[PDB]
Each structure stands twice: as C-alpha cells, then as structure tokens.
C-alpha cells in the first residue's frame, strides 16, 4: 500500500486521494499533526525538498504533487495509451492545474484583493477554462477526455468541477457536457464510493 | 516532419526552458515571435491556445500550449525521460523541485519594490539550505556525471539552466557545492550545449 504523508486536510495531496481511489487503489495515510511530526520526516532524510506532500510507494519517496501524480497515473494505465495521449492529458490537467491553484490559494489572498480576484476566476471559469473543456468533449462525442478511455484527466477535471461548485455552483450551468460528465464520472464505482461518507476525501478547510 | 515551432514574445520568460531542452537534443526549431497585442490576439482568434496563453509549441500535429506539457511531450520524443516509469519519478522530482525554485527567480522583477529585498533573501536562503543541497547530495549519492541513470536526462538541462540564472543573481551561491559546478561546466561543454551558449543561438538574454 502506498502511504501518504500530509497534514489532515485536502491541500496538495487531495488530488493524488482522488486519482488512488478512482484507480481501486487502497493507500494508507500517515497525518503529520505537529512541528514535531514534521521536523522527524525532515530528520529522517524523507523529504528531498523538505516538505510535503511525500508518498512512500514502491521503495521510493516522492515528494512533489505532480511526480507523485505522474508516477500513478502511468502505473495505474491512467495516463493514455502513447506520447500524443499524454501530451493531451498533460496539456488538459495543466490548465485544470492553473485553475485549481487560483481556488486554492483564495483564501490565504490579501482581504483587500480578494473581491477582485474572486471575480477574475469566475470570468476565467466562463470564459477560459469551461468552454475549453465543453469543446473538447463536443469535438469528439465520447464519454471521455481522451482516448475514449477513462484516463487522469476526467478525474482531475471532475474533481475540479466540485471544487468549483463549491465555490459557485450556476458556474457550470451552461456547459451540459461537463454537467454530463461529472455525472458519469461520479457514478463510476469507486468514484461513487470514494464520493460517500467514511472514505479518505477531505473536507473544505475552514 | 515539421521543425517544431514556437510562438511566445521574443524574450526568455516561459519558453526560455523549451528552447534548452530542444536545442540540448539536437532538435531543429523556428521560432514566431509575438511582438503586439494583436499578433496575441489572432493566436487566440485562430483557436491555437487551448487555454488563451503562449507559450504554444507546433509540434508532430499538435498546438501544445502549457510549459510542462510542451516539455514532457519533448523530453520523451528525445529519450531525455529516463528509461522507465522509476526513473521518470526522480527526474519529475528533482525538476519540479528545480521548477519551484526558477518560478521564485522568474517572477522577482514584478515583485512590488517594498517587498523585493525580503524576497531577494528568501530566494537566497532556500539556494543555500533547501536547494542547491538537495542537488549536491543527488550527485555524491551516485558519483555519475548526470542525475539520473547515468546517462543525460532532462533534468541535467533544467538544472544547467537554472545555475545559469543563480549565477545572474549571486555567483556566490554556488561556492560551496562543488558538484553542482562540475555539473554545469560538464554540460555546458556538451556539443549541442555548448552551440546553444554560443553566440547566434536561440538562447535569449536577460530583460531589461
């Protein structure tokens, strides 16, 4: 089992819960519940950047969200079937990337920009980022991002749409592929079952 | 097939770590620059940036925008992403690192003057104690003249690249990590690499 080291909280490693369960992976967490939690991982040589996110899998220690991503994807045929499907899924995920870390970085934002920056990612979300993903899907008709094929991509982007619905939930109201495809990916057995009570999903910070 | 084609401003910025990696591969590339609004205007007009932004890549059929997709794309085209998936994990590691550290770097010039002295040391600080150590013990780890399956990957490149612009900032900071300096003479005397840093390559000066 993999094992993954972070504070109790969505954060960084929230993206990685997600793509583990959707890939019928069972994975342990390890919180980090003080300084000295923290400061024994760093101690002990775990970290090679000294933070976290870090996961223990398969005799390595990989810390940086997106090489912990990368390494399961491709380890759980998530990642498409060749270069070119990478490069779409790459280029897709990197986009869904930039959006999710506006949103999550918003409420450490300055009060007094916040207003502001609130209203330029909605405007991103219309006017960017869903129309980008409703033409992918309208492009080709199929159920998935790519490939025809449930890849790391349709994961991270229904993640995201959740997050965004939290945020503001008539955000996605115009866009019914991607309203569709939340749907099909939430049904997906172990998505459904990592979307119920009891499992590792996270709550919204406070 | 098609030279790869890049359409980003004429300056380092986004692409600068692009024009390393294809040009460290032996790669031919051309280059369209995007001098106005306008120029940027009908890039997005034209329905070539997925996502509205350069940089955007030309390449194999493809209109890849997002720095990191362009570079995944390249680094496995051109066998500089390891040999399998284990070794991809440490080369993602260790340039998502090296990413980390080039954005701070990156960015500084627009930071807003009164808090730019304080960012300069922060900067300066993780080169010295998180960073620049990370590298060091990498290389003493193994004794290899590369960072990863003895055999250069790209992140040997980021990592050149990278003590190229700590040098701008402060020639100090790479003292102490004798590897490191090895590292960079080494591949900076790499044929393809040591064309680039010559003079009339693509390679793109600091602003001003």
Redesign the interface.
């Known amino acids: 089992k993999p094992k993954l080291h972070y504070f109790n909280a969505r954060g960084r490693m929230e993206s990685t819960r997600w793509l583990l369960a959707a890939a019928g992976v069972e994975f342990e967490e390890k919180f980090i519940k003080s300084a000295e939690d923290l400061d024994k991982l760093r101690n002990d040589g775990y970290l090679?950047?000294?933070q976290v996110p870090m996961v223990e899998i398969?005799g390595?220690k990989?810390?940086?969200?997106?090489?912990i991503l990368?390494?399961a994807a491709?380890?759980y045929n998530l990642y498409g079937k060749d270069?070119?499907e990478?490069?779409?899924i790459?280029?897709?995920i990197?986009?869904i990337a930039?959006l999710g870390e506006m949103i999550l970085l918003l409420p450490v934002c300055p009060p007094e920009e916040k207003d502001a920056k609130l209203a330029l990612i909605k405007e991103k979300i219309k006017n960017?980022?869903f129309p980008?993903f409703e033409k992918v899907l309208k492009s080709h008709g199929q159920d998935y991002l790519v490939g025809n094929k449930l890849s790391r991509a349709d994961i991270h982007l229904v993640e995201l749409l959740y997050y965004v619905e939290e945020l503001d939930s008539s955000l996605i109201s115009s866009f019914p592929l991607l309203k569709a495809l939340k749907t099909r990916i939430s049904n997906l057995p172990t998505v459904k079952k990592f979307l119920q009570p009891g499992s590792p999903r996270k709550p919204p910070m406070d």
């Open positions: 090679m950047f000294q398969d390595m990989l810390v940086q969200t997106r090489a990368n390494y491709s380890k270069i070119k990478r490069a779409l790459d280029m897709y990197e986009g930039d960017r980022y980008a």
